[PDB]
Amino acid sequence: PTWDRLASSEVSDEYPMLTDRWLFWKSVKWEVNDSAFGKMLVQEKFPQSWVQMDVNVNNIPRYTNIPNFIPFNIHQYMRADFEVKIYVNPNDFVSGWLIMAFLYQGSEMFDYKLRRNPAALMQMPHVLVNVGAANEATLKIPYRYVRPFMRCKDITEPLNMGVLFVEVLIPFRTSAASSAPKSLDVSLFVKMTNAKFTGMVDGSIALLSKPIALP
Amino acid sequence: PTWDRLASSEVSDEYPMLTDRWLFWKSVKWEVNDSAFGKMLVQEKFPQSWVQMDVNVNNIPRYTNIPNFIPFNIHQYMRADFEVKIYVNPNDFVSGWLIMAFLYQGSEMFDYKLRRNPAALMQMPHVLVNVGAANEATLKIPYRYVRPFMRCKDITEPLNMGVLFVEVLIPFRTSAASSAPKSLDVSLFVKMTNAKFTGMVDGSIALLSKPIALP
Amino acid sequence: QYYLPPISVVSSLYAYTRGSIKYKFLFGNNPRHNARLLVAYIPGISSDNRLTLERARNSAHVVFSLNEVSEFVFTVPYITDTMWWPRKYGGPQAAGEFVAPSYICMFILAMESVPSIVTIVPMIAAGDDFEVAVPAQPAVGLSRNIDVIYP
Amino acid sequence: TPLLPTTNDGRVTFGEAFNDLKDLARRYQLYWEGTILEGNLRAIRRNSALVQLPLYPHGLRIQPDVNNPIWNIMRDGHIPVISSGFRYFRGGLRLRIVVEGLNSCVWVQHHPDRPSIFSRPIIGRYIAAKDAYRNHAYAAYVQNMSVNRTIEVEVPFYQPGLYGMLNASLRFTGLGDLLIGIEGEQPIPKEGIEISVYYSIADDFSFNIFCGFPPMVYCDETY
């Protein structure tokens, strides 16, 4: 008697051998020269952008290639808790701060564009990252969604549970000299905690499409 | 202490939820008009032809599409016992017989072409199939190979453990009238019993090729 | 005028629904004929454009031998992302903008003493675990008076 | 530092506690108000809908204008403000529809399986073809306006998801349209009729996942 069991009679397929490990996702590079207050380094529909991080030459994501996304290829409904680690690489002669927060089903609020300001990001679940210490910081994102299961493929827009933000709380500031850097590197590791897939079909029974970006 | 454990330090990955069920493979149609003694209906490298039964438009097999062959996509070594069921469809006014036998690593014997004659097939492990009763018949093929594990992808020719034969023991014979058929349908179901995969890599790290046929 | 099953009429009186549906097939052959049928159901596809005998052989399917009985009963369960499903002919959305929570398909895999034509009659009833939710404007009406006044 | 001794959220100095925002959201506030004139309404109108009022816990999108200034200077009430801080909700509403200048009967129907299509109310004729009259078997409530001019109704949460979406823009996000209508031939007076709808939270209501508040504006610089 919990409400994920009230959506699907078929039991869930749980393959922890090929899920539940830290996967690398993206690395992003922010500049000294365009790092202001409220600069958006990462603004992604999550976990859609992570799971569809692998793209074709014609730019359709394929679940087949990463052993972590192997069940997303053969099911149609899925549900899982996430954790996003952010690592920035420690350069001692600079200073700056990153704020990373997650907005549950953010993209469909009427006031979405107003909630990007980093003042508003200090009110949703967030983490702070320096360049000195406080390099790594792990967020936690439990499954919270309108329906007890998310769709894995199209027919619109599967796997859009929220929006992940990474913004500049204190601008990337450097010393005035040439041995100083022009940028740094910020790497985002993901993993799934309670992965339940249901509605096991074939592959090639549903399609993916070239993914759309947030404004 | 068994000799599959003496080839691989990594333990085996066993996903019985997505393997170990009867999969359909091929259906073949044999005629009254070319059914003689020793006619070869099926002459395949097994289980290579079963696992690579799904082909591209450019004709490269893709493990990704059938939830049964999902581990063959992400590993490089594998080992498993098989069972081939053969079903022929019962037409009462005809008669004929099928003999199905399996020849361990047959394709590399110096006398391969001499062992196709159905007299020689009655000496390897085989089964007989009528059109009246004795419609279904299940063969059994334990894993017997030179090395304790089979390769799953190229670089030559992965998953070639033997040769499966289906030949005409007693010719397909009909009544001399028009309500008689010109052919029948013969369907081959496979399944895997002890599937152990090892050497888990990515996909797209090794390739498949357009498969070659036995002479 | 439509001869809706008992399950259809009751579900025109409610807003949501959920649970398995039973299909009972009845084959008008006689033991001389033989064939095979693959009845499968696919849980999340709403239009038949994309499915074929090798795509539908990977879902939950039973292969029916066409001679073991005349009356074959095949239960498609309830596998969805949500807990209640709206009806197709009341609200909410736009009629043919509808997505059923699964598809059922029937795939294949000639004597002169026997009738060529085998007729199949399908029957449909709700499964044992089936429920209906909120009373709503009935999607149907009695045909006592089938007259109407278009605008 | 030293801490300030407690008053039990005010029970010590005043008489009561104030420890929940859920409790302030149970005090009625203006949901929508407007007029409906005779031409603005429908032509063959014997059992017909008058307003199609989309039901949002965060209230309607306030149009601030000159001829009713509760929206211009007060903006929206305490209930839209508390609602903007939360992402989902699971409950019903309580309404009070005070329909003036009409003397016979006013049926109120609740359509819980209707999508959230508009953010404004639909007046009179423009109400869609299938909400234009009273339906069967939907939860309804008729009140004769000579006996009492105030309708008190509670709309339930009849909707299939784990939540209903606050702050919205199938699309089954909420608890669908409420419909208000006249029950017979009536004289629609000159200067039409005024409907005032007040709403609040019900006792089985909740606000669920707290994200931040959006940016606010101050009432004090409206003039």
Short mmCIF file of N, CA, C and O in Angstrom, two decimals, chain D residues 129-186:
data_model
loop_
_atom_site.label_atom_id
_atom_site.label_comp_id
_atom_site.label_asym_id
_atom_site.label_seq_id
_atom_site.Cartn_x
_atom_site.Cartn_y
_atom_site.Cartn_z
N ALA D 129 -19.87 24.88 -26.00
CA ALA D 129 -21.14 24.28 -26.39
C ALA D 129 -21.60 23.24 -25.38
O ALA D 129 -22.80 23.06 -25.18
N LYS D 130 -20.66 22.55 -24.72
CA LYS D 130 -21.01 21.42 -23.88
C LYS D 130 -21.04 21.74 -22.40
O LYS D 130 -21.41 20.87 -21.60
N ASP D 131 -20.70 22.97 -22.01
CA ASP D 131 -20.91 23.44 -20.66
C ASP D 131 -22.01 24.48 -20.61
O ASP D 131 -22.25 25.08 -19.56
N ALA D 132 -22.72 24.68 -21.72
CA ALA D 132 -23.65 25.79 -21.86
C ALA D 132 -24.96 25.58 -21.13
O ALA D 132 -25.74 26.52 -21.01
N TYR D 133 -25.22 24.37 -20.63
CA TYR D 133 -26.45 24.07 -19.93
C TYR D 133 -26.11 23.16 -18.77
O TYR D 133 -25.00 22.64 -18.67
N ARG D 134 -27.07 22.97 -17.87
CA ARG D 134 -26.81 22.08 -16.75
C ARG D 134 -26.77 20.65 -17.25
O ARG D 134 -27.64 20.21 -18.01
N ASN D 135 -25.75 19.92 -16.82
CA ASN D 135 -25.57 18.54 -17.22
C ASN D 135 -26.33 17.63 -16.27
O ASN D 135 -26.90 18.07 -15.27
N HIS D 136 -26.35 16.35 -16.59
CA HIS D 136 -26.89 15.37 -15.67
C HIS D 136 -25.77 14.83 -14.79
O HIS D 136 -24.59 14.88 -15.14
N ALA D 137 -26.16 14.34 -13.61
CA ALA D 137 -25.31 13.47 -12.81
C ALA D 137 -24.02 14.12 -12.30
O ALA D 137 -23.26 13.47 -11.58
N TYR D 138 -23.75 15.36 -12.67
CA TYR D 138 -22.68 16.08 -12.00
C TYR D 138 -23.18 16.62 -10.68
O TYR D 138 -24.37 16.94 -10.52
N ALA D 139 -22.27 16.73 -9.71
CA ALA D 139 -22.66 17.27 -8.42
C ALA D 139 -23.13 18.70 -8.63
O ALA D 139 -22.40 19.54 -9.17
N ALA D 140 -24.35 18.98 -8.19
CA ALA D 140 -24.97 20.27 -8.42
C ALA D 140 -25.64 20.70 -7.14
O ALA D 140 -25.76 19.94 -6.18
N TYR D 141 -26.10 21.95 -7.14
CA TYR D 141 -26.78 22.48 -5.97
C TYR D 141 -27.61 23.67 -6.41
O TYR D 141 -27.06 24.67 -6.85
N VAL D 142 -28.93 23.55 -6.30
CA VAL D 142 -29.84 24.62 -6.69
C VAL D 142 -30.23 25.38 -5.43
O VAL D 142 -30.52 24.76 -4.39
N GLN D 143 -30.22 26.70 -5.50
CA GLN D 143 -30.70 27.52 -4.39
C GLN D 143 -31.62 28.61 -4.92
O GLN D 143 -31.25 29.36 -5.82
N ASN D 144 -32.82 28.68 -4.35
CA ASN D 144 -33.75 29.75 -4.65
C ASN D 144 -33.23 31.04 -4.03
O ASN D 144 -32.96 31.09 -2.83
N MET D 145 -33.08 32.08 -4.85
CA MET D 145 -32.47 33.32 -4.39
C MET D 145 -33.41 34.19 -3.55
O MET D 145 -32.94 35.13 -2.91
N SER D 146 -34.72 33.91 -3.53
CA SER D 146 -35.61 34.67 -2.66
C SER D 146 -35.43 34.25 -1.20
O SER D 146 -35.55 35.09 -0.30
N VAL D 147 -35.13 32.97 -0.96
CA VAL D 147 -34.97 32.47 0.40
C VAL D 147 -33.66 32.98 1.00
O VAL D 147 -33.62 33.40 2.16
N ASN D 148 -32.59 32.95 0.21
CA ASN D 148 -31.24 33.26 0.66
C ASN D 148 -30.43 33.57 -0.59
O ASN D 148 -30.55 32.87 -1.60
N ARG D 149 -29.62 34.62 -0.53
CA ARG D 149 -28.84 35.05 -1.68
C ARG D 149 -27.39 34.59 -1.62
O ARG D 149 -26.57 34.97 -2.46
N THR D 150 -27.05 33.70 -0.69
CA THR D 150 -25.69 33.23 -0.53
C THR D 150 -25.65 31.72 -0.65
O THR D 150 -26.37 31.01 0.06
N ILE D 151 -24.81 31.22 -1.55
CA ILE D 151 -24.60 29.79 -1.74
C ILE D 151 -23.28 29.41 -1.11
O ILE D 151 -22.24 30.00 -1.42
N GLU D 152 -23.31 28.42 -0.22
CA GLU D 152 -22.11 27.88 0.41
C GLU D 152 -21.91 26.46 -0.10
O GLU D 152 -22.75 25.59 0.13
N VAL D 153 -20.80 26.24 -0.80
CA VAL D 153 -20.51 24.97 -1.45
C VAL D 153 -19.07 24.60 -1.15
O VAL D 153 -18.20 25.47 -1.01
N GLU D 154 -18.81 23.30 -1.07
CA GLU D 154 -17.44 22.81 -0.98
C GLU D 154 -17.17 21.89 -2.16
O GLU D 154 -17.85 20.87 -2.32
N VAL D 155 -16.18 22.25 -2.96
CA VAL D 155 -15.77 21.49 -4.13
C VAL D 155 -14.75 20.44 -3.69
O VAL D 155 -13.78 20.77 -3.00
N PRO D 156 -14.94 19.17 -4.03
CA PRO D 156 -14.00 18.13 -3.62
C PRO D 156 -12.82 18.01 -4.58
O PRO D 156 -12.83 18.55 -5.69
N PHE D 157 -11.80 17.30 -4.13
CA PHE D 157 -10.64 16.97 -4.96
C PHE D 157 -10.93 15.63 -5.65
O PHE D 157 -10.64 14.56 -5.11
N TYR D 158 -11.49 15.70 -6.85
CA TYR D 158 -11.78 14.53 -7.68
C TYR D 158 -10.87 14.61 -8.89
O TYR D 158 -11.26 15.17 -9.92
N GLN D 159 -9.71 13.99 -8.81
CA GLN D 159 -8.76 14.19 -9.90
C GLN D 159 -7.63 13.19 -9.69
O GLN D 159 -7.21 12.96 -8.54
N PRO D 160 -7.08 12.59 -10.75
CA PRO D 160 -6.43 11.28 -10.61
C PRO D 160 -4.96 11.27 -10.23
O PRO D 160 -4.42 10.18 -9.98
N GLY D 161 -4.28 12.41 -10.16
CA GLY D 161 -2.86 12.41 -9.89
C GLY D 161 -2.54 12.39 -8.41
O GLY D 161 -3.42 12.49 -7.55
N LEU D 162 -1.25 12.26 -8.11
CA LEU D 162 -0.79 12.35 -6.73
C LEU D 162 -0.98 13.75 -6.18
O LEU D 162 -1.09 13.92 -4.96
N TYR D 163 -1.02 14.75 -7.06
CA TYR D 163 -1.11 16.14 -6.66
C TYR D 163 -2.00 16.88 -7.64
O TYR D 163 -2.42 16.34 -8.67
N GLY D 164 -2.26 18.13 -7.31
CA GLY D 164 -2.77 19.09 -8.26
C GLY D 164 -1.76 20.22 -8.29
O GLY D 164 -1.18 20.57 -7.25
N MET D 165 -1.52 20.77 -9.47
CA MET D 165 -0.44 21.73 -9.61
C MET D 165 -0.91 23.12 -9.23
O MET D 165 -1.88 23.64 -9.78
N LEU D 166 -0.20 23.72 -8.28
CA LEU D 166 -0.28 25.14 -8.01
C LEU D 166 0.59 25.87 -9.02
O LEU D 166 1.47 25.29 -9.66
N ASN D 167 0.33 27.17 -9.17
CA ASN D 167 1.19 28.03 -9.97
C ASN D 167 1.24 27.59 -11.43
O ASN D 167 2.25 27.78 -12.11
N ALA D 168 0.17 26.97 -11.93
CA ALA D 168 0.15 26.46 -13.29
C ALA D 168 0.06 27.62 -14.28
O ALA D 168 -0.08 28.79 -13.91
N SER D 169 0.11 27.30 -15.57
CA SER D 169 0.02 28.34 -16.59
C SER D 169 -1.14 28.10 -17.56
O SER D 169 -1.45 26.96 -17.92
N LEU D 170 -3.27 15.93 -21.80
CA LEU D 170 -4.44 16.09 -20.94
C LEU D 170 -4.52 17.49 -20.31
O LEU D 170 -5.51 18.20 -20.50
N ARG D 171 -3.46 17.87 -19.59
CA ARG D 171 -3.42 19.06 -18.73
C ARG D 171 -4.52 19.00 -17.65
O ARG D 171 -5.41 19.85 -17.57
N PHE D 172 -4.43 17.97 -16.81
CA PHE D 172 -5.36 17.77 -15.70
C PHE D 172 -4.88 18.40 -14.39
O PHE D 172 -4.92 17.75 -13.34
N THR D 173 -4.47 19.66 -14.43
CA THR D 173 -3.63 20.18 -13.35
C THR D 173 -4.38 20.36 -12.03
O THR D 173 -3.75 20.32 -10.97
N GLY D 174 -5.70 20.55 -12.07
CA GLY D 174 -6.40 21.03 -10.90
C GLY D 174 -7.76 20.40 -10.67
O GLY D 174 -7.99 19.24 -11.02
N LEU D 175 -8.66 21.16 -10.04
CA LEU D 175 -10.05 20.77 -9.83
C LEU D 175 -10.90 21.63 -10.76
O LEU D 175 -11.02 22.84 -10.55
N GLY D 176 -11.43 21.01 -11.81
CA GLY D 176 -11.96 21.71 -12.97
C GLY D 176 -13.05 22.75 -12.77
O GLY D 176 -13.41 23.09 -11.64
N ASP D 177 -13.60 23.24 -13.88
CA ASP D 177 -14.59 24.31 -13.86
C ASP D 177 -15.72 24.07 -12.86
O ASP D 177 -16.17 22.94 -12.65
N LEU D 178 -16.14 25.16 -12.23
CA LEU D 178 -17.43 25.27 -11.57
C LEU D 178 -18.35 26.09 -12.45
O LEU D 178 -17.93 27.09 -13.04
N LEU D 179 -19.61 25.68 -12.56
CA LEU D 179 -20.56 26.35 -13.44
C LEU D 179 -21.75 26.89 -12.66
O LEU D 179 -22.35 26.17 -11.85
N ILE D 180 -22.09 28.15 -12.92
CA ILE D 180 -23.16 28.88 -12.26
C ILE D 180 -24.19 29.25 -13.32
O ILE D 180 -23.81 29.72 -14.40
N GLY D 181 -25.47 29.03 -13.04
CA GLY D 181 -26.48 29.29 -14.05
C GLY D 181 -27.87 29.46 -13.48
O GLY D 181 -28.16 29.06 -12.35
N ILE D 182 -28.75 30.06 -14.31
CA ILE D 182 -30.15 30.30 -13.99
C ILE D 182 -30.96 29.07 -14.40
O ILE D 182 -30.58 28.34 -15.32
N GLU D 183 -32.07 28.84 -13.71
CA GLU D 183 -32.84 27.61 -13.87
C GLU D 183 -34.13 27.78 -14.67
O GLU D 183 -34.81 26.78 -14.92
N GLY D 184 -34.49 29.00 -15.07
CA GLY D 184 -35.73 29.17 -15.80
C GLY D 184 -35.75 30.48 -16.54
O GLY D 184 -34.77 31.23 -16.57
N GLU D 185 -36.89 30.75 -17.18
CA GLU D 185 -37.14 32.06 -17.74
C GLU D 185 -37.11 33.12 -16.64
O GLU D 185 -37.79 32.98 -15.62
N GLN D 186 -36.34 34.17 -16.87
CA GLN D 186 -36.13 35.23 -15.89
C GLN D 186 -36.08 36.56 -16.60
O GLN D 186 -35.75 36.62 -17.79
#
